[PDB]
Design a protein around this ligand. Sequence first.
Ligand SMILES: [Mg+2]
Ligand SMILES: [Mg+2]
Ligand SMILES: [Mg+2]
Ligand SMILES: [Mg+2]
Ligand SMILES: [Mg+2]
Ligand SMILES: [Mg+2]
Ligand SMILES: [Mg+2]
Ligand SMILES: [Mg+2]
Ligand SMILES: [Mg+2]
Ligand SMILES: [Mg+2]
Ligand SMILES: [Mg+2]
Ligand SMILES: [Mg+2]
Ligand SMILES: [Mg+2]
Ligand SMILES: [Mg+2]
Ligand SMILES: [Mg+2]
Ligand SMILES: [Mg+2]
Ligand SMILES: [Mg+2]
Ligand SMILES: [Mg+2]
Ligand SMILES: [Mg+2]
Ligand SMILES: [Mg+2]
Ligand SMILES: [Mg+2]
Ligand SMILES: [Mg+2]
Ligand SMILES: [Mg+2]
Ligand SMILES: [Mg+2]
Ligand SMILES: [Mg+2]
Ligand SMILES: [Mg+2]
Ligand SMILES: [Mg+2]
Ligand SMILES: [Mg+2]
Ligand SMILES: [Mg+2]
Ligand SMILES: [Mg+2]
Ligand SMILES: [Mg+2]
Ligand SMILES: [Mg+2]
Ligand SMILES: [Zn+2]
Lengths: 122, 122, 53, 206, 113
Amino acid sequence: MIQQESRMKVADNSGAREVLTIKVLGGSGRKTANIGDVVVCTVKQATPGGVVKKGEVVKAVIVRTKSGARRQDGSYIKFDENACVIIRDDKSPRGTRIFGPVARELRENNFMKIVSLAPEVL
Amino acid sequence: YRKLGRTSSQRKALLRDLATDLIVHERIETTEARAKEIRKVVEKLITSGKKGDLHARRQAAAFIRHEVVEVVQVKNRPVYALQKLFDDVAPRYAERQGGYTRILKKGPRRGDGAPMVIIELV
Amino acid sequence: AVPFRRTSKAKKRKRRTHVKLQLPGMNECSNCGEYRLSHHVCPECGQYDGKDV
Amino acid sequence: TKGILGRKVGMTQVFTENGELIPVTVIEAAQNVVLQKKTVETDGYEAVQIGFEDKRAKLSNKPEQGHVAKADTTPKRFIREFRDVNLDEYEIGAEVKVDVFAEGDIIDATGVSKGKGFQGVIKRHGQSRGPMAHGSRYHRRPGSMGPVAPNRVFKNKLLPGRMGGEQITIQNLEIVKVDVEKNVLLVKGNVPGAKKALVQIKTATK
Amino acid sequence: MNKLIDEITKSQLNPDVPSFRPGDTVRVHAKVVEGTRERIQLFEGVVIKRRGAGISETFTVRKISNGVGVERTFPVHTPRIAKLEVIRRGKVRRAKLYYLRNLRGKAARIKEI
RNA sequence: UGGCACCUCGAUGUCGGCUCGUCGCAUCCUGGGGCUGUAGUCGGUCCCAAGGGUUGGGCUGUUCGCCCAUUAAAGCGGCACGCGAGCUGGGUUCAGAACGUCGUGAGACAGUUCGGUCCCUAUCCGUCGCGGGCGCAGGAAAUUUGAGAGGAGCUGUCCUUAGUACGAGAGGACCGGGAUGGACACACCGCUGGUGUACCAGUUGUUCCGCCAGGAGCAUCGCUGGGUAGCUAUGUGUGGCAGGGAUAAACGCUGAAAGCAUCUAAGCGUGAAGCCCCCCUCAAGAUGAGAUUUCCCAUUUCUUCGGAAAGUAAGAUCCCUGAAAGAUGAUCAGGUAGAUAGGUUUGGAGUGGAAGUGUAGCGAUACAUGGAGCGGACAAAUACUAAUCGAUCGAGGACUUAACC
Ligand SMILES: [Mg+2]
Ligand SMILES: [Mg+2]
Ligand SMILES: [Mg+2]
Ligand SMILES: [Mg+2]
Ligand SMILES: [Mg+2]
Ligand SMILES: [Mg+2]
Ligand SMILES: [Mg+2]
Ligand SMILES: [Mg+2]
Ligand SMILES: [Mg+2]
Ligand SMILES: [Mg+2]
Ligand SMILES: [Mg+2]
Ligand SMILES: [Mg+2]
Ligand SMILES: [Mg+2]
Ligand SMILES: [Mg+2]
Ligand SMILES: [Mg+2]
Ligand SMILES: [Mg+2]
Ligand SMILES: [Mg+2]
Ligand SMILES: [Mg+2]
Ligand SMILES: [Mg+2]
Ligand SMILES: [Mg+2]
Ligand SMILES: [Mg+2]
Ligand SMILES: [Mg+2]
Ligand SMILES: [Mg+2]
Ligand SMILES: [Mg+2]
Ligand SMILES: [Mg+2]
Ligand SMILES: [Mg+2]
Ligand SMILES: [Mg+2]
Ligand SMILES: [Mg+2]
Ligand SMILES: [Mg+2]
Ligand SMILES: [Mg+2]
Ligand SMILES: [Mg+2]
Ligand SMILES: [Mg+2]
Ligand SMILES: [Zn+2]
C-alpha cells in the first residue's frame, strides 16, 4: 500500500538512493499501489556522481512491499522493506544491477529485464 | 456474561463476596439479575470441592474470602470458609451432577422497586 | 427549543392516552386461597409449589 | 429452473483440481416436500409451494395440520414459493433432493441479513466524519438537511435508524460440491444471514 | 467447532505432513508452477506462527535473504507442497515468535535441542 | 457592475472552508446523427440527448488565479451569492500596542502589522425508524398477486481482425470477438490483519493470606508478549450481463395534391448511455381495504323491535427460561407432549510446559513425572436446577337482485 508522500528505498545501481512518491497511475481516483505497479516519483537523495541527479522527476516500479501480494494458491509473501526500481518509458531499468530479492509478481507484468538481473525471485 | 452496573475491578470483588455468603449462610437475599450471576460461580466452586486435590484447593482458595464461619471447641479452633466448602458442602453433593442452587422469586423492594429473590443451596 | 404556542386541553389529554399502567398478573393460591402473583413465592402462607420454602 | 430451501451451516474452504483454494458455504437441505401447485385457472399465476423442516406436533396447530394432510406429510416449519418454474414435474408430495443441481451450476441465494440495532449515519449510510481536532465539534453527525427556501426537509434525507434485517439476494454465485448422502450443498462465496438462517436457492435468472 | 464441516473436509486433510512447532527450521519443497512448467523451489527458514484449526491451519516461515527479511505463509494441507522437512528443532518460550521481525543476526539465534 | 428605496432597526448573523445534497441545460466525458478546407489517424461546427460520471497536491484568509502530477472528463449556473437553534473562526467589524502619512491638538486612514468570550433541555409541521387502536358485514393459521413507489444506470487499457481498407510516403482505422482494471454498491468472517477490561503467560514496588512454598489487593486493564466468541476493512464473494416495445435528431420505401418530382398529406421501415420494460427492494389503510389452501361451527338468558350479555370452539395472550433479535414495545427459539437458559461429562480454539515430589548444582536456575495445567462468549450428549400452578380474551355470521340449486 503505497500512496502520495510515501518514501521507499531504491534497489538498483542508478544514482538515486531515496524516492518520494508523487502520484499513482491507473485511474482517476486511485489512491494505493502495490507490487508490480508503476508510480511517478521524485528523488530526495542521491549518491555523488550518479546518473540520476537529486531533484529529478522519474517513473518507477515497486518490487517489494511491507505488505506483499497473495497468490491464487492461497499462499502469501511479505518483505521487511519497501523498495523501488527506476525504469525508462519502456520496461527497461535505468540502472545496471538490481539488489535484494524480488517478488515473482513482476514476472507476470513483462518486467523480464528486472527479473533476470535480480539475485533471486521469490 | 453480564455487567452489574460497576467496573471490572468492583464486579470481581462483588462476585467473591456473594459467593462466600451463600457458602457460609446457605440462604441469602439478592436482586434477580444479581442472583443469576453467582449461580454460575458457586456451582463451579462446588466442583472444585468434589475433586479434593491440593491443586483444586489452591485454585478455589484464590476466590473464597477469609473469614471464620464459626468457632469449634475442639482448645479453640476457628473454622474458615474454605474448610466448610471442602469438608461439609462438597460431600453433600457427591451424587448430584449439576444444579446445587435454586432461585425463588419474592417481589419488589420498597425503596427502588428492585425484584428480590431467594437463592438457596440445595 | 422553546414552545411556540401553548398546548390545549384536547392535545394535552390525547397525548396521555398511553400514559396508563397495566393490571398486575395476579392469581389464586390453592392452599391459602388468596390472591398471588404467578411464578412467585406466596408471601403470607409462605410457600411455593406446596413446599413451604 | 429449479429451487430448494436450506439452512446456513457455516463457512470453510476447499482445494480445487487445479490446485487453487476457494471459500465455500455449507447448506443443509433435508426434508423438502412439494405441498401445493398453483395454476392460472385457480390463482392466475404459476408457482410451487415447498416445505423445508418438520416440527413436533405440539408446535403445529389445527389449521396447518389439514393443509399438509393433503400431501400426506408431517407439519413443516418453513414454507415458500417458487415462480417461473416448470410444472410438468413436481407431483404433490414428492421429495425434492439436492441432486437436482450439479457441478458448476449458477444459482441465486436469497436470505435475511444479520441484524444491527439503532445505527448512526456513518455506519448505516457510509457518510463522512467531520474533523476530529482543530477545535471542531462536528464528529459523527448527519449534515445539513437542505436549503432554506422549501421551508421543509425533502424525502430521502438519510438519517439514523434500525440497520439490518432486510431481504437481500446475491446473483451469479457458483456451486462447488454437491452431496446426496449428507444432503449438503457447497456454494462458493457468501450468503446473507447468520448461522442456522433460512437460505432459498434458485437457478440464476440471468 | 462444527461437526458437519468436519466430515465434508475430512478427505482433503494431507496425512504426510510431519509434526513441527513454531521455532524450528524447516525446508519447504514448494512447487512453483508457471504457465506450462512445474519446478520445485526450496524455501528454508524458521517457523514463526501456526494458527487455525482443521484444513484452515496455516504456518509462516521466515528467511533472511540478501540482507532483506522475507516471510512466507502456506496452508498446512495444500497439495502444492511436494514434501516438508524439519532440519533442526529449536527451543523457544513463545507460541508466536513476532519478536524476530526487528532483530538482526547474532541476536536472532535460536538454540537447539 | 448599477438605478429605486417597496418588507425587516421591540435584531432577517455577514466572507471562505467542512458535512449533506437537490434542480436547470445555454453539454466537460460517455450515446445517436447532418456538414466539412471529411483520403487514413487526429479534428472543427451544428442538431437530439440531463442516465451516470466529473482528481490529488505547492503559494495565499482567500472566491479566483498561477504552478507540479494525473484523468474518458477535470462543465456553467439556481436553491437568503443553498446549508453557523449542523461545525470552524483564518478574514471582515469593539476595547491594547506599533509603523508610514494627515492634523497645532484630542485623533484619523476600506493603508499595514501582533493579540483578541460564537448562548439555547425541540412545543407544532417536516425527515428517519419502531409500536398501540379500529377498520376491511362470522371468528382464525399460513402462502401470495400487484396498482403505486424507491435503488441501480459510470468507464479505461491490452490482444486479434491487421500493418488489412486508405495513402506515394510518413503514417494508419470503423464495424466484431477476447482478456483484465479504476471508482462505486450489497453481503460475509473461511483466508490476511484490527479490537477483544470475567482467556493464558512474564515482570517491578508495596500491603495482605501467621511463616517457606503457593496466591490475592492497588498502582491507566500497573506494565509487557499473545488471543476465543462477537463487531470489523485495508480482506473475500458478487453486481451494473445479454436483451424487448415505442420514440428524438436523422436516413429511407410507396405515393398524390400538381399526369413529372418530393420521406408526408393517408400508410409503412430502420433509428440514442435517453422513455416504458428486463434486474433488486417496499408495497391491500390500494377505506377501490384483493386472491388461494386449511380449521371451528350454528349454544344459553332476555327481548315489543332494532338487538342486548355470557359461558365457549378453532386460535391467541398474560406469566416464566432466553437469543440468531433488540433503546422500550415488537421479532424469533421454548414452557415437563421439554434440550430454552444455567450446571455436569466429553471435546475445540488460545496460551504455552501447572501445583506437589524427585534429580544436578554452594547459589540464581535447569531437567523429569507431562503438548502438562488452565481454558468468557464455540460444539455434542445429559432433566441435575429454573420454565410449577392458573387466568384472560376470542363466532353463531344484515338486506336486495341474478344464476344455479
Ligand atoms: Mg493497504
Ligand atoms: Mg485496577
Ligand atoms: Mg415470507
Ligand atoms: Mg470533539
Ligand atoms: Mg494452536
Ligand atoms: Mg420580534
Ligand atoms: Mg439542448
Ligand atoms: Mg458524438
Ligand atoms: Mg461530427
Ligand atoms: Mg447527464
Ligand atoms: Mg511545505
Ligand atoms: Mg443574489
Ligand atoms: Mg450564502
Ligand atoms: Mg440555519
Ligand atoms: Mg486603540
Ligand atoms: Mg506633525
Ligand atoms: Mg496569545
Ligand atoms: Mg440539541
Ligand atoms: Mg398496525
Ligand atoms: Mg476475520
Ligand atoms: Mg513467600
Ligand atoms: Mg488495598
Ligand atoms: Mg494486554
Ligand atoms: Mg446493458
Ligand atoms: Mg425498434
Ligand atoms: Mg384479505
Ligand atoms: Mg447459544
Ligand atoms: Mg409461545
Ligand atoms: Mg444446556
Ligand atoms: Mg516444570
Ligand atoms: Mg542440590
Ligand atoms: Mg418445579
Ligand atoms: Zn398461599
